[PDB]
């Protein structure tokens, strides 16, 4: 899965 980043 994606690593955590806002937006």
């Amino acid at each position, epitope marked *: 899965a994606e690593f*955590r980043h806002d937006s």
Partner: antibody
Amino acid sequence: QVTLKESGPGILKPSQTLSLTCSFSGFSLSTSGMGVGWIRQPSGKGLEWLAHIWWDDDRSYNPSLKSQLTISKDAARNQVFLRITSVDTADTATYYCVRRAHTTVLGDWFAYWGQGTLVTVSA
Amino acid sequence: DVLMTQTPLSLPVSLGDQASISCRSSQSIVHSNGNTYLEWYLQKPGQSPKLLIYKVSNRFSGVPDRFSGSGSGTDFTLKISRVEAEDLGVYYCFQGSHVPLTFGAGTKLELKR
């Protein structure tokens, strides 16, 4: 000013459990958007990401090492920890503690690195 | 895993030469939020890696403008316009969009003689 300082056992034997500590200053892991993590490097070789832990207890791991890795923190004491079970000689490396935020303002990149702690796994 | 492939892995250069390092990813590094978390780091002997470039083409604070990054999607390039002795060391591209976070193998910028 942001500082990160790794500590470990120096030398341990294969099959033992590695317990790493990162102590930092200049920021807080209770801050929304903040994270702290671990990357390692065997001597003369490349960089391998291990794990990251977020302000809200969301933990992210390198899936290949999931059976050996546990990341935790103590936000109040400005510490993060990494436990690696069943080490072998190939876990010999410099272990770096790194800050990375998940918000643009707090710095979504590895700008701050500790100087690293060397861990030698040998019998 | 998103594999980050750097070419060449050793790059001899003369002082003042242009240098260019290719970094290709096995899948797109564009995150769902629209950002491309492609970073470049330089590591000098006995030292921790230092951030040079983030989001493909932004220079980190204090990085001289002889350094630039470019590209899109899966295909990226680091460029140094005039190589100085301070630039010698190991360059890593990196992707931060997908778990596990992954670095390229490292490209050693070395001196021609």
